Design an enzyme around this catalytic site. Structure first.
Site, PDB file in Angstrom:
ATOM      1  N   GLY A 215      -3.340  -8.578   5.073  1.00 10.92           N
ATOM      2  CA  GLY A 215      -2.507  -7.600   4.225  1.00 10.92           C
ATOM      3  C   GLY A 215      -1.695  -6.853   5.387  1.00 10.92           C
ATOM      4  O   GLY A 215      -2.458  -6.854   5.943  1.00 10.92           O
TER       5      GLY A 215
ATOM      6  N   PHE B 164       3.237   0.924   7.645  1.00 11.77           N
ATOM      7  CA  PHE B 164       2.009   1.320   9.021  1.00 11.77           C
ATOM      8  C   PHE B 164       0.884   1.006   9.169  1.00 11.77           C
ATOM      9  O   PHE B 164       0.096   1.666  10.227  1.00 11.77           O
ATOM     10  CB  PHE B 164       2.571   3.435   8.519  1.00 11.77           C
ATOM     11  CG  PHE B 164       1.398   3.717   7.504  1.00 11.77           C
ATOM     12  CD1 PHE B 164       2.128   3.902   5.999  1.00 11.77           C
ATOM     13  CD2 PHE B 164       0.386   3.764   7.837  1.00 11.77           C
ATOM     14  CE1 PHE B 164       1.840   3.724   5.195  1.00 11.77           C
ATOM     15  CE2 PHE B 164       0.044   4.252   5.605  1.00 11.77           C
ATOM     16  CZ  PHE B 164       0.806   4.567   5.129  1.00 11.77           C
TER      17      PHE B 164
ATOM     18  N   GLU C 163     -16.946  -3.380   4.153  1.00 11.85           N
ATOM     19  CA  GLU C 163     -17.515  -3.899   3.841  1.00 11.85           C
ATOM     20  C   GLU C 163     -15.704  -4.737   3.703  1.00 11.85           C
ATOM     21  O   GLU C 163     -14.724  -4.574   3.192  1.00 11.85           O
ATOM     22  CB  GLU C 163     -18.243  -4.028   2.386  1.00 11.85           C
ATOM     23  CG  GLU C 163     -19.138  -3.280   3.032  1.00 11.85           C
ATOM     24  N   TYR C 164     -16.286  -6.264   3.684  1.00 12.16           N
ATOM     25  CA  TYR C 164     -15.153  -7.626   2.872  1.00 12.16           C
ATOM     26  C   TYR C 164     -15.758  -8.377   2.411  1.00 12.16           C
ATOM     27  O   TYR C 164     -17.142  -8.203   2.036  1.00 12.16           O
ATOM     28  CB  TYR C 164     -15.078  -8.821   4.282  1.00 12.16           C
ATOM     29  CG  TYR C 164     -14.377 -10.016   4.206  1.00 12.16           C
ATOM     30  CD1 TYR C 164     -12.900  -9.695   3.737  1.00 12.16           C
ATOM     31  CD2 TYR C 164     -14.738 -11.033   4.340  1.00 12.16           C
ATOM     32  CE1 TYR C 164     -12.073 -10.944   3.441  1.00 12.16           C
ATOM     33  CE2 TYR C 164     -13.798 -12.162   3.287  1.00 12.16           C
ATOM     34  CZ  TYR C 164     -12.591 -11.876   2.807  1.00 12.16           C
ATOM     35  OH  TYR C 164     -11.913 -12.383   2.814  1.00 12.16           O
ATOM     36  N   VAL C 165     -15.121  -7.879   0.819  1.00 13.50           N
ATOM     37  CA  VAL C 165     -14.478  -8.621  -0.514  1.00 13.50           C
ATOM     38  C   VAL C 165     -14.100  -9.469  -1.023  1.00 13.50           C
ATOM     39  O   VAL C 165     -13.061 -10.274  -0.643  1.00 13.50           O
ATOM     40  CB  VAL C 165     -14.491  -7.399  -1.136  1.00 13.50           C
ATOM     41  CG1 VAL C 165     -15.213  -7.650  -2.635  1.00 13.50           C
ATOM     42  CG2 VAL C 165     -14.952  -5.807  -1.186  1.00 13.50           C
TER      43      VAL C 165
ATOM     44  N   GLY D  14     -10.946 -11.527  -2.963  1.00 10.02           N
ATOM     45  CA  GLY D  14      -9.409 -11.361  -3.358  1.00 10.02           C
ATOM     46  C   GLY D  14      -9.302 -10.580  -4.443  1.00 10.02           C
ATOM     47  O   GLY D  14     -10.192  -9.414  -4.479  1.00 10.02           O
TER      48      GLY D  14
ATOM     49  N   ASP E 272      -4.156   5.772  -6.618  1.00  9.51           N
ATOM     50  CA  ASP E 272      -3.744   4.745  -6.094  1.00  9.51           C
ATOM     51  C   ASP E 272      -3.410   3.138  -7.137  1.00  9.51           C
ATOM     52  O   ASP E 272      -4.308   2.197  -6.972  1.00  9.51           O
ATOM     53  CB  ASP E 272      -3.666   4.507  -4.677  1.00  9.51           C
ATOM     54  CG  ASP E 272      -2.320   3.343  -4.498  1.00  9.51           C
ATOM     55  OD1 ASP E 272      -1.665   3.830  -4.598  1.00  9.51           O
ATOM     56  OD2 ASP E 272      -1.858   3.578  -4.084  1.00  9.51           O
TER      57      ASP E 272
ATOM     58  N   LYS F 126      -3.753   0.499  -9.521  1.00 10.90           N
ATOM     59  CA  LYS F 126      -3.295  -0.784  -9.498  1.00 10.90           C
ATOM     60  C   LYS F 126      -4.176  -1.805  -9.643  1.00 10.90           C
ATOM     61  O   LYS F 126      -4.565  -1.510  -7.994  1.00 10.90           O
ATOM     62  CB  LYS F 126      -1.620  -0.961  -8.604  1.00 10.90           C
ATOM     63  CG  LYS F 126      -2.010  -0.983  -7.062  1.00 10.90           C
ATOM     64  CD  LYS F 126      -0.372  -0.534  -6.422  1.00 10.90           C
ATOM     65  CE  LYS F 126      -1.110  -0.779  -4.541  1.00 10.90           C
ATOM     66  NZ  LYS F 126       0.176  -0.089  -4.670  1.00 10.90           N
TER      67      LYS F 126
ATOM     68  N   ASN G  58      -5.546  -3.103  -5.698  1.00 12.43           N
ATOM     69  CA  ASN G  58      -6.424  -1.813  -4.958  1.00 12.43           C
ATOM     70  C   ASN G  58      -7.802  -2.568  -5.747  1.00 12.43           C
ATOM     71  O   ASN G  58      -8.778  -1.609  -5.231  1.00 12.43           O
ATOM     72  CB  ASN G  58      -5.941  -0.482  -5.175  1.00 12.43           C
ATOM     73  CG  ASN G  58      -4.854  -0.620  -4.057  1.00 12.43           C
ATOM     74  OD1 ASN G  58      -4.404  -0.917  -3.078  1.00 12.43           O
ATOM     75  ND2 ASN G  58      -4.272   0.846  -4.307  1.00 12.43           N
TER      76      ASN G  58
ATOM     77  N   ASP H 170      -8.244   1.276  -1.072  1.00 12.55           N
ATOM     78  CA  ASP H 170      -7.194   2.216  -0.425  1.00 12.55           C
ATOM     79  C   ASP H 170      -7.403   3.520  -1.188  1.00 12.55           C
ATOM     80  O   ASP H 170      -7.155   3.665  -2.283  1.00 12.55           O
ATOM     81  CB  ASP H 170      -6.045   1.603  -1.003  1.00 12.55           C
ATOM     82  CG  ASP H 170      -5.140   1.185  -0.157  1.00 12.55           C
ATOM     83  OD1 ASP H 170      -5.402   2.751   0.801  1.00 12.55           O
ATOM     84  OD2 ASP H 170      -3.556   1.295  -0.288  1.00 12.55           O
TER      85      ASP H 170
ATOM     86  N   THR I 146       2.349   3.846  -6.475  1.00 14.46           N
ATOM     87  CA  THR I 146       3.291   3.368  -7.230  1.00 14.46           C
ATOM     88  C   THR I 146       4.017   2.945  -8.403  1.00 14.46           C
ATOM     89  O   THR I 146       3.568   3.380  -9.520  1.00 14.46           O
ATOM     90  CB  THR I 146       2.377   1.390  -6.818  1.00 14.46           C
ATOM     91  OG1 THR I 146       1.522   1.887  -5.775  1.00 14.46           O
ATOM     92  CG2 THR I 146       3.671   0.274  -7.268  1.00 14.46           C
TER      93      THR I 146
HETATM   94 CL1  LIG Z   1     -11.459  -7.283   0.903  1.00 14.45          CL
HETATM   95  C1  LIG Z   1     -10.524  -6.005   2.270  1.00 14.45           C
HETATM   96  C2  LIG Z   1     -11.623  -4.522   1.727  1.00 14.45           C
HETATM   97  C3  LIG Z   1     -10.489  -3.309   2.236  1.00 14.45           C
HETATM   98  C4  LIG Z   1      -9.253  -3.571   2.128  1.00 14.45           C
HETATM   99  C5  LIG Z   1      -7.608  -2.656   1.954  1.00 14.45           C
HETATM  100  C6  LIG Z   1      -7.883  -1.612   2.325  1.00 14.45           C
HETATM  101  N1  LIG Z   1      -6.693  -0.488   2.458  1.00 14.45           N
HETATM  102  C7  LIG Z   1      -5.532  -1.218   1.530  1.00 14.45           C
HETATM  103  C8  LIG Z   1      -4.599  -1.150   1.256  1.00 14.45           C
HETATM  104  C9  LIG Z   1      -4.105  -2.354  -0.444  1.00 14.45           C
HETATM  105  O1  LIG Z   1      -2.675  -2.009  -0.820  1.00 14.45           O
HETATM  106  C10 LIG Z   1      -2.294  -1.356   0.204  1.00 14.45           C
HETATM  107  C11 LIG Z   1      -2.403  -1.700   1.821  1.00 14.45           C
HETATM  108  N2  LIG Z   1      -3.605  -1.676   1.951  1.00 14.45           N
HETATM  109  N3  LIG Z   1      -6.724  -3.132   1.305  1.00 14.45           N
HETATM  110  S1  LIG Z   1      -9.177  -5.174   1.985  1.00 14.45           S
END
Ligand SMILES: Clc1ccc(-c2c[nH]c([C@@H]3COCCN3)n2)s1
Ligand SMILES: Clc1ccc(-c2c[nH]c([C@@H]3COCCN3)n2)s1
Length: 340
Positions: free
Chosen positions: A40, A44, A111-113, A116, A156, A158, A161, A174, A191
């Site tokens: 993603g 910033f 952690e990686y989920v 999705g 936040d 939504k 997230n 997030d 949002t």
């Molecule tokens: Cl697997 C994942 C683990 C953590 C993730 C994460 C943290 N912060 C975001 C955001 C989502 O909304 C806008 C900007 N990036 N994703 S993904």
């Protein structure tokens, strides 16, 4: 409430405060990881799947460009995000595993989920049945009961997230707008479709904005679209402050009743913000079939298990242009980010 719940929340607050008052810092560095894929990207920062070179474990690394954080007026928010994430602990919150900074960037290694975003699955299926929406909503109610007890506002909520894990449970990601607030706070953030009226009207607001956003989330999960939809934000905002909401005829009467009380424009009448707090939500008829303890303990079979091949599978995330992770030879914005 039951003393067992009160004592659980008292311990949760004690543990949070100890980490909050003494935050961890500088617990890894960039060259400990291999970069795998961009999951993603935003104005910033970005999130990248990485692999730790010595353990082989996979993580989601959030990378924020310090200079862009400063330009977009996100310094305090990014400091909030990391300080809160390193201090919380709850079954439905993504875990921060390492954090660090370098000359150019801030890094939060989580952690990686692999399942999705809820957003992808909702748009693929169209809408969730009420039992499926209720399973996810119960996890959010418990997570907000936890966060609010620590005086944290999330701000936040939504579908993008909320990630779906290997057991079909939610992991909230997030914390970029999360903040420790005793009383009111004033920042315009979140949002458009999910903003409570008192945010749009520039008032001092409180944790009731999270319960409004839960109303929007439950509506969107069960309908397939959010309640205040329109083409441009100013039109969305007019709909929100009118609070006129139309429910699909397939909604149950209990769901409509809960949603009228969460999507209550007057924050002093909104469920979650009355004398009984979260228990007006937990005891509502729409949640009569929910076993709150079984959800917390992750003992309920999930409605849906995401399809993925293993902990490094990125098939449930989408494709972005792959950009460098550049580190300047000179330190940028060191003062602003001293505490990170
Ligand atoms: Cl697997 C994942 C683990 C953590 C993730 C994460 C943290 N912060 C975001 C955001 C989502 O909304 C806008 C900007 N990036 N994703 S993904
Ligand atoms: Cl928000 C939450 C408020 C209260 C919660 C709670 C009460 N009791 C428990 C569990 C059940 O058995 C395992 C450990 N204690 N969670 S979560």
């Amino acid at each position: 409430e039951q003393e067992s719940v009160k004592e659980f929340l008292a311990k949760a607050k004690e543990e949070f405060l100890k980490k909050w008052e003494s935050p961890s810092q500088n617990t890894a560095q960039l060259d400990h990881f291999d970069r795998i894929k961009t999951l993603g990207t935003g104005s910033f920062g970005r999130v990248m799947l990485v692999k730790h070179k010595e353990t082989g474990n996979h993580y989601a690394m959030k990378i924020l460009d310090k200079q862009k954080v400063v330009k977009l007026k996100q310094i305090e928010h990014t400091l909030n995000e990391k300080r809160i994430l390193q201090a919380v602990n709850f079954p439905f919150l993504v875990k921060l595993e390492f954090s660090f900074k370098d000359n150019s960037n801030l890094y939060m290694v989580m952690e990686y989920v692999p399942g999705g975003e809820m957003f992808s699955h909702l748009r693929r299926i169209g809408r969730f049945s009420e039992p499926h929406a209720r399973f996810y909503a119960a996890q959010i109610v418990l997570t907000f009961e936890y966060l609010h007890s620590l005086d944290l506002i999330y701000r936040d909520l939504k579908p993008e997230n909320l990630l779906i894990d290997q057991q079909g449970y939610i992991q909230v990601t997030d914390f970029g707008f999360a903040k420790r607030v005793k009383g009111r706070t004033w920042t315009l953030c979140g949002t458009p479709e999910y903003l409570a009226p008192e945010i749009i009207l520039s008032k001092g607001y409180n944790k009731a904005v999270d319960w409004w956003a839960l109303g929007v989330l439950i509506y969107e999960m069960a309908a397939g679209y959010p309640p205040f939809f329109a083409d441009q934000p100013i039109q969305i905002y007019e709909k929100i402050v009118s609070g006129k909401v139309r429910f699909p005829s397939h909604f149950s009467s209990d769901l409509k009743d809960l949603l009228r009380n969460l999507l209550q424009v007057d924050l002093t009448k909104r469920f979650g913000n009355l004398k009984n707090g979260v228990n007006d939500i937990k005891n509502h008829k729409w949640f009569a079939t929910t076993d709150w303890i079984a959800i917390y303990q992750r003992k309920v079979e999930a409605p849906f298990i995401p399809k993925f091949k293993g902990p490094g599978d990125t098939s449930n995330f989408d494709d972005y242009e792959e950009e460098e992770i550049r580190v300047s030879i000179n330190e940028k914005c060191g003062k602003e980010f001293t505490e990170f």
